[PDB]
Amino acid sequence: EYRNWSKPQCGITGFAPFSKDNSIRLSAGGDIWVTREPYVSCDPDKCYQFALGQGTTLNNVHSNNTVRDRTPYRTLLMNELGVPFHLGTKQVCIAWSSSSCHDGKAWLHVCITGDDKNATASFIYNGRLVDSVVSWSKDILRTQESECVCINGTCTVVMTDGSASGKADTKILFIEEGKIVHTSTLSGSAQHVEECSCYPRYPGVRCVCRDNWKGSNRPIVDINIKDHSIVSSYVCSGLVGDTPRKNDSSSSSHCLDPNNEEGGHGVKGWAFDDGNDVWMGRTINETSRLGYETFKVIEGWSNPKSKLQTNRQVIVDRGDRSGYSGIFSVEGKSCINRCFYVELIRGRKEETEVLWTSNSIVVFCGTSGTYGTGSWPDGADLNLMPI
Amino acid sequence: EYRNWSKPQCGITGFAPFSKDNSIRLSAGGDIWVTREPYVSCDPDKCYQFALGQGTTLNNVHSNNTVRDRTPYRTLLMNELGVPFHLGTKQVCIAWSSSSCHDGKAWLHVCITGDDKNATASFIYNGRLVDSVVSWSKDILRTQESECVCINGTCTVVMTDGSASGKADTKILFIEEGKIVHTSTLSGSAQHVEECSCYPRYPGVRCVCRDNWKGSNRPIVDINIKDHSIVSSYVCSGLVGDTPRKNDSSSSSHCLDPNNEEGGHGVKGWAFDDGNDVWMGRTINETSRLGYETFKVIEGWSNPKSKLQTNRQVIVDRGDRSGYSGIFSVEGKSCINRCFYVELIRGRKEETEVLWTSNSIVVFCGTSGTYGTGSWPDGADLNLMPI
Amino acid sequence: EYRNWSKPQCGITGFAPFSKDNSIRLSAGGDIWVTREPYVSCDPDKCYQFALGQGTTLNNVHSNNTVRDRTPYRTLLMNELGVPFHLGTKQVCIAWSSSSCHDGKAWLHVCITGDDKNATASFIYNGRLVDSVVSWSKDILRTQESECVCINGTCTVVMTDGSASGKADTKILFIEEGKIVHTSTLSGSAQHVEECSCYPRYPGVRCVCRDNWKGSNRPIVDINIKDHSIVSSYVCSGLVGDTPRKNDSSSSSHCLDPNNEEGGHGVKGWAFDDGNDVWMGRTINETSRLGYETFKVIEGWSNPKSKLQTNRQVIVDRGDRSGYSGIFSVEGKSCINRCFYVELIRGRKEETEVLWTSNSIVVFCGTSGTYGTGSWPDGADLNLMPI
Amino acid sequence: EYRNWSKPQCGITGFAPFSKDNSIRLSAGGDIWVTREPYVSCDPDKCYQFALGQGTTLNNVHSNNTVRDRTPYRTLLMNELGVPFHLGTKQVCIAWSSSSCHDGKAWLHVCITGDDKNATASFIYNGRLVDSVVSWSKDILRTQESECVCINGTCTVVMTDGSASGKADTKILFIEEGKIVHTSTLSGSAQHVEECSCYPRYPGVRCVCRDNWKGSNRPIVDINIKDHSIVSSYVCSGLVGDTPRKNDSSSSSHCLDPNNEEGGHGVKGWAFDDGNDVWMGRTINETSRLGYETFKVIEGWSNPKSKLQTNRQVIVDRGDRSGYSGIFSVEGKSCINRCFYVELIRGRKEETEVLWTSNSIVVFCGTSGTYGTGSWPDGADLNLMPI
Ligand SMILES: *[C@@H]1O[C@H](CO)[C@@H](O[C@@H]2O[C@H](CO)[C@@H](O[C@@H]3O[C@H](CO[C@H]4O[C@H](CO)[C@@H](O)[C@H](O[C@H]5O[C@H](CO)[C@@H](O)[C@H](O)[C@@H]5O)[C@@H]4O)[C@@H](O)[C@H](O[C@H]4O[C@H](CO)[C@@H](O)[C@H](O)[C@@H]4O[C@H]4O[C@H](CO)[C@@H](O)[C@H](O)[C@@H]4O)[C@@H]3O)[C@H](O)[C@H]2NC(C)=O)[C@H](O)[C@H]1NC(C)=O
Ligand SMILES: *[C@@H]1O[C@H](CO)[C@@H](O[C@@H]2O[C@H](CO)[C@@H](O[C@@H]3O[C@H](CO[C@H]4O[C@H](CO)[C@@H](O)[C@H](O[C@H]5O[C@H](CO)[C@@H](O)[C@H](O)[C@@H]5O)[C@@H]4O)[C@@H](O)[C@H](O[C@H]4O[C@H](CO)[C@@H](O)[C@H](O)[C@@H]4O[C@H]4O[C@H](CO)[C@@H](O)[C@H](O)[C@@H]4O)[C@@H]3O)[C@H](O)[C@H]2NC(C)=O)[C@H](O)[C@H]1NC(C)=O
Ligand SMILES: *[C@@H]1O[C@H](CO)[C@@H](O[C@@H]2O[C@H](CO)[C@@H](O[C@@H]3O[C@H](CO[C@H]4O[C@H](CO)[C@@H](O)[C@H](O[C@H]5O[C@H](CO)[C@@H](O)[C@H](O)[C@@H]5O)[C@@H]4O)[C@@H](O)[C@H](O[C@H]4O[C@H](CO)[C@@H](O)[C@H](O)[C@@H]4O[C@H]4O[C@H](CO)[C@@H](O)[C@H](O)[C@@H]4O)[C@@H]3O)[C@H](O)[C@H]2NC(C)=O)[C@H](O)[C@H]1NC(C)=O
Ligand SMILES: *[C@@H]1O[C@H](CO)[C@@H](O[C@@H]2O[C@H](CO)[C@@H](O[C@@H]3O[C@H](CO[C@H]4O[C@H](CO)[C@@H](O)[C@H](O[C@H]5O[C@H](CO)[C@@H](O)[C@H](O)[C@@H]5O)[C@@H]4O)[C@@H](O)[C@H](O[C@H]4O[C@H](CO)[C@@H](O)[C@H](O)[C@@H]4O[C@H]4O[C@H](CO)[C@@H](O)[C@H](O)[C@@H]4O)[C@@H]3O)[C@H](O)[C@H]2NC(C)=O)[C@H](O)[C@H]1NC(C)=O
Ligand SMILES: *[C@@H]1O[C@H](CO)[C@@H](O[C@@H]2O[C@H](CO)[C@@H](O)[C@H](O)[C@H]2NC(C)=O)[C@H](O)[C@H]1NC(C)=O
Ligand SMILES: *[C@@H]1O[C@H](CO)[C@@H](O[C@@H]2O[C@H](CO)[C@@H](O)[C@H](O)[C@H]2NC(C)=O)[C@H](O)[C@H]1NC(C)=O
Ligand SMILES: *[C@@H]1O[C@H](CO)[C@@H](O[C@@H]2O[C@H](CO)[C@@H](O)[C@H](O)[C@H]2NC(C)=O)[C@H](O)[C@H]1NC(C)=O
Ligand SMILES: *[C@@H]1O[C@H](CO)[C@@H](O[C@@H]2O[C@H](CO)[C@@H](O)[C@H](O)[C@H]2NC(C)=O)[C@H](O)[C@H]1NC(C)=O
């Protein structure tokens, strides 16, 4: 019954289109939730889309000023992958920061809400609140904003608390059926860890996070489910996946330290290793969240100084808006597949023709077959949309 | 198969956020039922939200004059906890007063509708009408407006018939698979019992009710599911839970009689005992349904005169609107958890910029862990909402 | 697995409120189907509501001229009892005349559509067309517009083909798993048989129909499931149940023939026997479909002269609009319960304030307990409703 | 658990009405997806309707110029047959060309999206992306736009890549649990094959496709599942089924070569054999997609030159708009039934009073019983609908 993820990783030549919600285009006519920070997590049968709602729909007076990150009205929305967030969507918890797990038996939802300086993380398993923890650093308590990983019934979630531009207290929480059985402080050379994209790498869990303080390379967290040991490093690929960053010719990376190159900010992204190579996704624009591309870097997991990429796919065209991206793993007949979602942010603080901020999602899954090219942007025309 | 509730009560240090519907905020764009008197009740798998609809949506001509409590068009709406009352919501019965039960096998709905002087209580178990009873006092027959409790197949419901300002005929009905197998009149020191927040306290059921006549101290009712024996008293804490009430310094309780302190009105509320202590919720405002706080009174269940607060939590900010609150119990892996919901009333008779009266809910569940602070109001701005 | 209906009839002292959809009231804000001729049928777990949609919602340009009975766009809508016919409602077949069956294993739908003089009846069982029959009299082929009855896997449906103002070819069709295994021409003294309300009277099926030709007393069709025998008579009760009819002073019934009293025209209605007594429902208004009452006539199933009324209930107030009414049976724990629905027609012809014709439904179920009084009309204000 | 379709073909005397969508009529009030190229597939329990959405609803600013066939926002929508494509509809994949299969265990969705010259076909089985293939001719890679057929766990899909007017590369793909196990190049005497309407003809699969280059007669692809052999021919029927075509008096067929009679364009249609006879459907207009008729041709499957017709049914009236039509097979108790759908296109490039292009569907199933006449058009009044 419990998921162990003991199958090997599927061979990947690239990624094929999997799902698209068209949320903003459907919002022009119809009642669609205002969302941001989405992710995808699958039970053994089907996949689900999650998002942090803003307590309002897009064609709504309350969609004004929905660029704010933390409000009391934010809830975690949960639909089947493909079903857009309409008025029949279930909100499973109060959360302006979220992470969701299926251990093979039931869903685990990790939900953070409340005051910025005194925040509660609620742990809801099988529809019941099982445990809760208060912010330890008395700062903005935040979690992965993506799917977490359960192996043998033990789910791991990464939680950060403290300064976003300085030393912060990151904890790895071990949850069994909604109950916190252990809490390990982050160890290793990753100095700043935030919004980890975690995937099962049996016998443990590997997380690729964002360094929001001093690195454009992505921190790596390796979690051993049995021993509970934590080790930290950075993605060694010379092509860094964080935005902002330097250009490919000028960007540099380090196997153990942040590269100190346009690292003061960041975006949620993902990466996974295929032997010594790394499969990564990032925004095409080096400074803004415009476009999205995925590629494989040869020896990009074991060698800094490697800027040799291949199998590049354009997910979102460079002229179109992207946002958070994360990984999620789907068990196959014989192997574990790696899939990723891209959040397509539209609205305020970058497009001022509307008063709201919302997102769409495009989902791609790894394939061992062949694929073509294309681009799958949000596609809404905000000049004609209600304000 | 039949829920017994024989597990002990979970150790509670407070309550963690559980659910929020944002009903009024979603009403501004989208078709949402006009509801009042909500409550939460869970089958052994997931929790459900209930409310008494007004036969209309909010952006509707029929949402005017919806402050009225008893209309022929009121129905009991039932969704999964989290799903807002959209047009796909199932109205399970006709009722302007309702109570719902799950005994572990099927749902029991107690639904009261009809003429105020001659009302019918229909008992629907497993989707069928199994029994019905007429008013005995030929006055407004009313029930809990919250979850009832079923132990070993037998569900107990408190029903009141008579004046809200003088002796009323309160009966406890024992229902097995929808059939009324016993009816016992209320006996004990509580003289006005209405809208009882009942919870399982094995081997019995304990209800904390509203005295609309002479009390600010909430009445208590204890049912022996075995001897169909009913005992009545009041809550002993010197910090009373009813609204209106006196200051915290000037208030008193007797917990064998009403305190005769500003007791000429009331609001549905909850309290449960933790040894000699009492966990209780109330409005922060002593005169109006503004704000909501929960706290634990030291020896507040046994010592009239205890006013020692601890573990206070602000659920709704004092400036924000609250309403009915009630308790519901969720079975855990080793203990029984106590959770509560707060109805957030918005609209007429207190906010005259709209013509409708409706509510959202916020749900909190007892936690043995830690939590922070916050406030989770309705959040809808009625100045911009359709009138 | 197959339903036999072998239990006796539950002792009925009257009827208690069961369900109310508030369709027209919710139509003012929200997308609700335009329907007419509804009915209720239940599978061994839930009750479903059916209606003949007009291919449009109420707030729609196509709701104009929805007073037409037979259009190519009419489909049979099927929702759970309580869920209003919103946009997510499933239309199970094309039909402007319908009847639905659950034999304990799967749903049977008898759907009539096509030309008025060459109508086609489709038989859909378990989601599949199993059989089809053409109109045999080349006039409006019609069926019960209510639930049909299956015993031991054999469902029986009453179909009429011919004129509404004279003799018509009424046939009784025996259907097994969607397949017509036998077709019996109507036999007996009933001269015009239409829109039968059938209930299981084990070992057979009893149908109370309307005479649209020469009688205000309701015809009876007795169907033997074992022998496929058909027997026809009239409800003997001197208080006739059809509309139009004579006043209670001048009503007469023959118990074998139509009474020749305002018998032209009619409304779909219901009746069932309780020993020698009859439980029947009818419009309060003798000439119009205004109001609804249910009562019991003492010795009304055997004595053509009995006018002794008792146990009268007002379902819809005298000034409010009723419509079609029909019976459906629910298997209880020890007996078979009889329930009835009343269609609440609103709109064109009678109410010229709107351009559409639609309906709401109110459902009552038999009870052995006590009950009060009340009135549950449609309750929509058509002066403010969109036209 | 795997569907073998081993039962004989049902004796068919004609077709009976099964399902109607009314999508465009419901679009006037209510949020309904803009769709085109629909089809029907059934699992062992019930039937589902599929359509290629345009990423927008009809009463939407993005509904403008929805006449384009390939956009990044097009997705495959999936509801149960009878549920209109409302906002709760699940889009199961990104596709502007699609084909869907149920093999008895799980759904297989074949979805093509991306650039015109480098389109990607994604193979999604049981909710997971299993395989993927790129365009082989670097042109518009397209598939059946109807249900594919699975036998003994092996599903077969016909894929065309290349010129729409000229020789193109057609491949038959054998898919097992989402994985492409074999790929067969089209062989036989058919020169242009597109949008095949395939049905199980045990022990193989037979497809009736459209010749878009040189023929108004329809090509036939016979697929042997046992040994993956492909043979091709045309339909001998002197009454050809493609639109445009010549009139009945001047048409002809060869069933080894295209008839070279107004074969420059085409429409997706269906045919199946009844011994030596053929049941086919086509537009009543020989040059436009107006009306729809079905009939049987005596010796039409084995004799070019036959023009003898029987059992003609008008599905859509001659002056009403039709579109794509395809076949789907339903397993009965003892026989395999052949059913078909007709797409009712409304909107741009033929009706200029609206800016959108969308469709409704009507479904008919084969019957061994009797049936009447009728016409079941889309029925929306576009002069009154929003742009
Ligand atoms: C139909 O779809 C398929 C799949 O989507 C497309 O095929 C894919 O095409 C992409 C290129 O469009 C292949 O990407 C790989 O690109 C590597 C470099 O990427 C470039 O883009 C990034 C953008 O950020 C730039 O930074 C890079 O530029 C910098 O670095 C390069 C280094 O060379 C410098 O040249 C630049 O000046 C910049 O400084 C690039 O612009 C590329 O290196 C990679 O590798 C091929 O070439 C190397 C070296 O020559 C070979 O060693 C290697 O084996 C590859 O060549 C093989 O494969 C190709 C394709 O089969 C054959 O033609 C060769 O003969 C040889 O066998 C590669 O180009 C991606 O790999 C490829 N995917 C697949 C699955 O093949 C099709 O284009 C598309 N067709 C259409 C639209 O018509
Ligand atoms: C981050 O989150 C946590 C969790 O939410 C928060 O910690 C909680 O803080 C509240 C403070 O409200 C603690 O609640 C308890 O409040 C009791 C008094 O309630 C007061 O408010 C109501 C309305 O405002 C008034 O009616 C009462 O006033 C009456 O009585 C006071 C008496 O002082 C009079 O001043 C008034 O005039 C009225 O007559 C109160 O004002 C309070 O009594 C209770 O107990 C603490 O204080 C007493 C008395 O000194 C101590 O005996 C007792 O031990 C408690 O003090 C602490 O003791 C130890 C210290 O190590 C620890 O056990 C705790 O720290 C404990 O607080 C108490 O104040 C609630 O208990 C607490 N929840 C926890 C820790 O679980 C944090 O505030 C929040 N932080 C930030 C940064 O926002
Ligand atoms: C609280 O709710 C309960 C439950 O809903 C209500 O009680 C029910 O009340 C109704 C009406 O009072 C009872 O229905 C029966 O009505 C029969 C006549 O119906 C009348 O309405 C129809 C339509 O308008 C008219 O056509 C009739 O008029 C014609 O007939 C009468 C006589 O038949 C003529 O006088 C007229 O000129 C017309 O020709 C009526 O207006 C009624 O006959 C029936 O019988 C009771 O009364 C007769 C005469 O006394 C007795 O012989 C018979 O045995 C019945 O008496 C019973 O009831 C009393 C108490 O009710 C007991 O003490 C006796 O033991 C005996 O059981 C009856 O009136 C319906 O029966 C009743 N249901 C119950 C009790 O379950 C309450 O009224 C309501 N109270 C409120 C609103 O406060
Ligand atoms: C109630 O519903 C039922 C069922 O839906 C309807 O019955 C069906 O009616 C249709 C139409 O009559 C029957 O279809 C058959 O049509 C054949 C060809 O149809 C014609 O239309 C097409 C297109 O419009 C034309 O192409 C045809 O060819 C003509 O035009 C070309 C031009 O190039 C000329 O060259 C031709 O010469 C034609 O002029 C036709 O106009 C038709 O061939 C077929 O034939 C019957 O009659 C022939 C000759 O008389 C017999 O050989 C053959 O066996 C058929 O006879 C049987 O059926 C009739 C009718 O049932 C019986 O009377 C006979 O006893 C015998 O059983 C035929 O007409 C369709 O078969 C029929 N479906 C049934 C019965 O299941 C009812 O009409 C409808 N009733 C209403 C509206 O009241
Ligand atoms: C990456 O994105 C930024 C836009 O986000 C582009 O820079 C802008 O260029 C336009 C003119 O084309 C100016 O009006 C804006 O002020 C610029 N900056 C911003 C932050 O808006 C930039 O050209 C893009 N290209 C790359 C590859 O850096
Ligand atoms: C709480 O309520 C009591 C009783 O109403 C208040 O006591 C009154 O206080 C005022 C001003 O101090 C005096 O003039 C009155 O004589 C007091 N008695 C009465 C019966 O009114 C007390 O002030 C209130 N305190 C708070 C915390 O608001
Ligand atoms: C409890 O709530 C009432 C409102 O229901 C408060 O009364 C208001 O007080 C404010 C500020 O003093 C005035 O501006 C309003 O006009 C008052 N409203 C009315 C009519 O009462 C009351 O002050 C609150 N009490 C406490 C202790 O906060
Ligand atoms: C069917 O098609 C044929 C051929 O297209 C038509 O025959 C032509 O009719 C026109 C008059 O309209 C003549 O001028 C041509 O010479 C004819 N051509 C042939 C091939 O003879 C025929 O009229 C059409 N018939 C129907 C019933 O539409």
Ligand SMILES: *[C@@H]1O[C@H](CO)[C@@H](O)[C@H](O)[C@H]1NC(C)=O
């Ligand atoms: C109550 O029911 C539970 C079912 O989980 C059972 O384990 C327990 O032993 C029962 N206790 C009593 C008092 O019957």
Ligand SMILES: *[C@@H]1O[C@H](CO)[C@@H](O)[C@H](O)[C@H]1NC(C)=O
């Ligand atoms: C129903 O089935 C039983 C056998 O299961 C049989 O004895 C009985 O006669 C059947 N009833 C009818 C009415 O056909």
Ligand SMILES: *[C@@H]1O[C@H](CO)[C@@H](O)[C@H](O)[C@H]1NC(C)=O
């Ligand atoms: C096809 O499936 C049915 C049901 O499983 C089975 O009875 C039949 O033998 C099968 N035929 C073949 C060819 O396997």
Ligand SMILES: [Ca+2]
């Ligand atoms: Ca950074």
Ligand SMILES: [Ca+2]
């Ligand atoms: Ca009181």
Ligand SMILES: [Ca+2]
């Ligand atoms: Ca009549």
Ligand SMILES: [Ca+2]
């Ligand atoms: Ca052609």
